[PDB]
Subunit: 234 residues, 4 copies
């Protein structure tokens, strides 16, 4: 089974598996049941921004999700990722839909990891436009790149209609060296902008930024509440 | 007085004003009496590296100080800097000596400030300090070099530190460190330093700090006050 | 005199002083009389992007100005800035109007310089505050409250004013070359909105590099772009 | 054959294939015969720095090689890489030895690529320390990394002596999007530091930073003067 650190933007409360009874941002460490959540007012059809911060000094995994009117939700969990994550990982964006559905449109994704000193090893990438054949992204499941310049993690119909029982992920092509014992500071940040839209009063299931073993793949059956991330809801 | 946030590398235990009883790093929030400290083994005449990190999301200001052998000290403090600093600030390095002394040499210094939101950002790096470093406001006893170095406190051309000394270097531009509509207002800073002393103890330390724009060395803030504070409250 | 290096987006053909007979971009080296120009189709009331890059190794100062439709103008000039600029400088944006006028609105501005053997400076403005403390505003510039930098004088339904000159300089001096720098490079990017209902628009926006103490020269409204004392 | 844009630090003059009669930095466009060279004083056993810059506005491919004493050699060639390179590439470092040899030690490598339009897609990586199992590098031929934190492009013997007839390359794992038609600026730069040490009547053959097709492979027989870059000396 893969190892997952994720920040989930969970649009659909699955109260039978420990979701609060509201849409929430969450920090997930090796379980879909978030270690920490914050109530999130998903603004339907608006462009949201998620920013994810971690460094190995503070060891605080933090995420904010904001929309341009100003509504933000933030969540943090102190967690020592040296003890969770393989040294070398892939980083990715994941989304899913189940009985209910939403567009899980990515409009930009940036990522920076650094290992300083003690000098710096670093990876940074930015995608503000996704390309039809995006050679530095590993697309899994239903994830597709436009154009439009967007990354549709899950299936959207010809007529605009998001489809249920969809899951897809984008992972950056290069392995990322997330920690290294000799490093004084290991830090990462990620930001992505997304367009979650539902004509259903029931958007589902959400979007995650995730960190994974290098060979990570969509667990069989991880549509819906499992967010393309987990094989079960344990 | 000034509003001060700082990460002190405090080489001299002033246990009478709250220092722990060893060299230490500490996070100073409007007071020289740190909100959190960690024991710090300062390695005499070694080049050390201090990394300071804040994000507005985590609301946690963290510092690590390390030397090449791997030995490191870390302090974090939970704090919302929106509640502490003014929107606009200067960032700087400060050092002092007192009745005891040490070199407070800065070999490099970087800083990055970002405000989203879109994004405003400032980043500078000094790996070399010119004799005329026009983008630094030197205050008190700093000195720009050669040795290519920034000397926060008085040394002799021949390496020897001086007592009762206080010096700061502030970056020339004001920095917009937070802003009420910023969803992320983060910064980090790193400096490398060489603290050397033949004294009976080393004193007093170097701090990275953030102050109001018009911040000057407060009267009599040599020694334990680290060029930062008007008194020890 | 000030020493000036600039990339002008010159919206008004001053052919008496060597402008080409069309709006143009140019590379200004110690003179308003461009060392190199390219024809520029300014798109009125559109947002444009200027990208300036100087390659210390390549010894080449290059600019593109584009608009969202893909229309671009490009100019490069081969020049060793070690022999032109003083070592310490301020960088900034300058615009002017004269007898004809345009909005000279800056919506964003970024800048990066690096001196390697590495010192660096980078700043990005995507929004300008009404009190933007890290900008030295000169003349009729003017930031906020709409998040924009208004280099010359607009009233207030956005209607441009004539005889206006305004530049904005980053508050910190920049160490733009050094004798012992193996690489002394910079780029700048600014996005702009030039709008006019005049007969022509005038006069243009420049990115400039100048001495630290550089001020708007007396009578540098108009074709002088707030940059130069005369048109030699 | 692969398509190759390289900046070569060529230590050994192969005057029978158009090299000048001195060591040199060269710009190579689809030939080992540099389009532009500059005389280079290789400082044997010193750490050199090479910086390579290009953007699609000036279209000038520039390279400098310097040593701490301040000896530098600069080379530039105007060339439109849109017309040379495939849209998507891998970037790498390559070295070779033939009859004569040298260590071709890489101590750091940074690379940044950006595609800007009207305000970006970007890749940036820095290696200041190469690790024993550096998962984001594709190592080809004799190239090895770490524990000493270096990349040895070509064979160095147990006793420190560089071996002849060696070729190795390191390519960054992810494909790079080097040009894109809708971009108003495409730029890249690369920096690497290196330590070429040789013992006799002797240094060969050089180090190149190169840009190639994604599936670029060491051409058979590309030891020696071909720098691990070219199938032949044409
Ligand atoms: C020698 O120990 C000293 O005690 C003195 C009085 O008992 C007093 O002056 C102390 O302070 C001076 O020196 C230290 C270390 O340099 C500074 O921290 C002080 O601010 C002061 O300058 C010292 O504990
Ligand atoms: C009406 O809500 C649902 O009750 C269903 C009956 O058991 C159940 O299938 C459904 O879950 C499905 O859809 C969810 C929202 O998309 C998703 O989280 C689940 O994994 C599943 O697909 C929900 O409980
Ligand atoms: C009518 O056009 C003008 O011709 C005038 C007579 O020569 C002249 O004064 C005027 O120049 C002014 O306006 C220009 C465009 O705004 C400006 O470039 C000049 O410096 C001057 O202010 C323009 O040529
Ligand atoms: C001593 O000069 C050599 O003459 C040899 C016989 O023709 C020849 O093989 C040799 O070239 C070899 O060594 C070079 C330096 O390493 C290398 O560039 C060649 O590719 C080849 O391996 C050189 O010309
Ligand atoms: Ca859920
Ligand atoms: Ca103390
Ligand atoms: Ca003109
Ligand atoms: Ca050769
Ligand atoms: Mn959840
Ligand atoms: Mn203390
Ligand atoms: Mn002109
Ligand atoms: Mn050659």
């Amino acid at each position: 089974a893969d190892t997952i650190v994720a920040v989930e933007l969970d649009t659909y409360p699955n109260t039978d598996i420990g979701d609060p009874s509201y849409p929430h941002i969450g920090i997930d460490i090796k379980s879909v049941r978030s270690k920490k959540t914050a109530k999130w007012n998903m603004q339907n059809g608006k462009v949201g921004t998620a920013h994810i911060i971690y460094n190995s000094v503070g060891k605080r995994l933090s995420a904010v999700v904001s929309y341009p009117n100003g509504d933000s939700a933030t969540v943090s969990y102190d967690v020592d990722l040296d003890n969770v994550l393989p040294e070398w990982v892939r980083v990715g964006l994941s989304a899913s839909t189940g009985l209910y559905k939403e567009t899980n449109t990515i409009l930009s994704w940036s990522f920076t990891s650094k290992l300083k000193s003690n000098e710096t090893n670093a990876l940074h990438f930015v995608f503000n436009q996704f390309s039809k054949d995006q050679k530095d992204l590993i697309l899994q499941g239903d994830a597709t790149t436009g154009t439009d310049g967007n990354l549709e993690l899950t299936r959207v119909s010809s007529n605009g209609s998001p489809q249920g029982s969809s899951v897809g992920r984008a992972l950056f092509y290069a392995p990322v060296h997330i920690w290294e014992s000799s490093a004084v500071v290991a830090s990462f940040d990620a930001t992505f902008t997304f367009l979650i839209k539902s004509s259903d009063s029931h958007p589902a299931d959400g979007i995650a930024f995730f960190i994974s073993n290098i060979d990570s793949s969509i667990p069989s059956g991880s549509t819906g509440r499992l967010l393309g991330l987990f094989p079960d809801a344990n």
